[PDB]
Design a protein around this nucleic acid. Structure first.
Lengths: 106, 97
DNA sequence: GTGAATATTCTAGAACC
DNA sequence: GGTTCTAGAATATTCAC
């Protein structure tokens, strides 16, 4: 009864064997994608019918996830990418009961 | 006077040293991006202030380029006025807004 | 099976730089 | 003008009945 995207996202983020690529941020308030490229080509196709980060991000925004922006505020590197962080008020570590409040947009 | 992006794109596709990643398609009517991930990581920042395929693709669409469908099958984009050996045609390409 | 909801893809709007 | 994040639009595909 819960959309497949949301149940798969929870599993993804929660599952320890994926934590190198996708995991909870340090205070359970958001999830991280640590290695976008290996995530997209190895992890995504095991759960979805694609290997495109763009199509994963589309879904995130569709369910109202928002990217957490980190900027540089200082020195620029240029020698390291990302990582990528997304947040939703009802996608929270050790509160899976909140997931039912997440709603697709249109 | 020509937009940075168009003259940079033209350089990228045309330059033999980059053809492992980005090159004219076989009949000069479109270009191909053969290895999206290395293209983006290693080539894009040599010419632009980023390394995101997505930001490159936003610019392509902004200038009216369109992805060619193909019935990961490499990536192909087309613009009627972006044609191999017809660099004169580039001045006809216009940013959209 | 059929009509809707959802998924995936491609392109564009908007804010910011 | 360029880069980023989010959403519109156009198909595919899946789901609930």
């Amino acid at each position: 009864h819960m959309p497949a995207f949301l149940s798969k996202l929870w599993t993804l983020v929660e599952e320890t064997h994926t934590n190198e690529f996708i995991t909870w941020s340090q205070n359970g308030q958001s999830f991280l994608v640590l290695d976008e490229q290996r995530f997209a080509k190895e992890i995504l196709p095991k759960y979805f019918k694609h290997n495109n980060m763009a199509s994963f991000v589309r879904q995130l925004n569709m369910y109202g996830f928002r990217k957490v922006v980190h900027i540089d505020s200082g020195i620029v590197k240029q020698e390291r990418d990302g990582p990528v962080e997304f947040q939703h008020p009802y996608f929270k570590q050790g509160q899976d009961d909140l997931l039912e409040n997440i709603k697709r947009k249109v």
